């Protein structure tokens, strides 16, 4: 009944959110609420649906901490990139070595928060996955909390937009 319908509804959800061109835009609604759950330690982080570099490419997802993680715990919004175990990993080049640009979109489209980084391939974060997800890599100090919590353009109508762009050069 449930391990029944539940699983099917989840598949459809994942399918509806997936992209296959290395470009993902993640709309996080109910910002205010999710924000406090983070601040209170109840739900520190959120995973995004999966997306890919190409139809049969790398599988990836984002991981965000509204009240921060690591060196940014309690002071910054922390945003991470996660390499997942993909159905076609046996056909891909490992380690993962594509530039990844992470963004928090300014809804007035004037000043987006942006961090473009090239993986340091020596990190285990980029090796071929053995588990469902590799260790995340990314930006612990992506965005100071003050920018997304009173007085400005990133939060609008209780929602924010996170964008990821995986550079496909070499693929």
């Amino acid at each position: 009944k449930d391990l029944a319908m539940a699983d099917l509804e989840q598949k459809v959800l994942e399918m509806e959110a997936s992209t296959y061109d290395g470009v993902f835009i993640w709309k996080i609604s109910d910002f205010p609420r999710k924000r406090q759950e983070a601040v209170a330690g109840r739900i520190p982080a959120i995973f995004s649906p999966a997306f890919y570099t190409s139809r049969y490419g790398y599988k990836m997802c984002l991981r965000i901490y509204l009240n921060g993680d690591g060196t940014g715990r309690g002071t910054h919004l922390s945003l991470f990139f996660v390499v997942m175990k993909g159905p076609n990993d046996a056909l891909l080049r490992w380690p993962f070595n594509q530039k990844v640009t992470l963004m928090l979109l300014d809804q007035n489209n004037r000043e987006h928060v942006i961090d473009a980084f090239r993986p340091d391939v020596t990190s285990s974060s980029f090796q071929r996955p053995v588990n469902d997800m590799n260790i995340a890599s990314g930006c612990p100090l992506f965005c100071p909390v003050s920018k997304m919590e009173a007085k400005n353009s990133y939060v609008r109508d209780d929602a924010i937009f996170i964008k990821a762009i995986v550079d496909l050069t070499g693929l």
């Binding site: 060196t71 715990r73 002071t75 473009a116 980084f117 993986p119 340091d120 890599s137 100090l141 100071p144």
Partner: protein
């Protein structure tokens, strides 16, 4: 394993009210000098550029956060001693002061490896090193620093 490497974030902040490092960085005509100041201070008291690397400079509230990459556990130890003894800070106060054209720019530093604040662990160097190694460097040098390096170099030519 194969080669000892690690990372940590160095928090740098001013004491005098004006010498705000955040704005000094976003300033088109200061950024290069601040960059140069940080680079010179690290190479002076922290370690050579091949053993101590800057991966990124975060403008983040009104301090500057420098993401560091350490190559070699021994050199990292040298950095830590220079940090706790105040040598790193001494060189940074001098270079920044010269960079922003000021008599003095007293500094307040902070050192973190992940969620671990090393300032509260300076007495145990082995623990600090272990915490730094736990943070695997995951990104190469940020393009912005290469851009500033080009700028620094083109300026010194004429």
């Amino acid at each position: 394993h194969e080669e000892w490497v690690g990372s940590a974030y160095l928090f740098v902040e001013s004491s005098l009210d004006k010498v705000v490092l955040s704005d000094a960085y976003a300033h088109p005509q200061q950024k290069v000098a601040v960059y140069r100041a940080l680079q010179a201070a690290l190479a002076e008291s922290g370690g050579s550029p091949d053993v101590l690397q800057m991966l990124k400079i975060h403008r983040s509230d009104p301090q500057l956060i420098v993401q560091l990459r350490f190559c070699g556990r021994q050199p990292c130890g040298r950095f830590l001693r220079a940090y706790r003894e105040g040598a790193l800070r001494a060189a940074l106060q001098r270079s920044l002061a010269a960079a922003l054209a000021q008599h003095s720019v007293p500094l307040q530093l902070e050192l973190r490896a992940g969620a671990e604040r090393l300032d509260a662990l300076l007495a145990d160097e082995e623990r600090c090193l272990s915490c730094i190694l736990a943070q695997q460097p995951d990104r190469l040098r940020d393009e912005e620093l290469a851009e500033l390096e080009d700028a620094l170099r083109n300026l010194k030519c004429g």
